[PDB]
# Entry
Amino acid sequence: DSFVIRGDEVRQIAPGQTGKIADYNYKLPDDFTGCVIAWNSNNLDSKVG
Amino acid sequence: STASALGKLQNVVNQNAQALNTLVKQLSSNFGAISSVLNDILSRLDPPE
# Structure
């Protein structure tokens, strides 16, 4: 599963988390097995306009 | 007139009653948790702890 989020919201992508992204957009199971990968694309996904 | 001649049966009854009473009493202990009642724990913390 792929998406783009703000820099400060990456903390909410974890089992048993609470916030705004974790409960309204993407909810993870408590016993989730797998892995999470995150990197930065300010030079690609952000524009001067 | 003379009492205390039937100590054995009274002792058996007292032992049974005391064992049941202490088994019931044990419900109020803490056992190292934050409270002795489940509802307060459920209604004051998120599931992870």
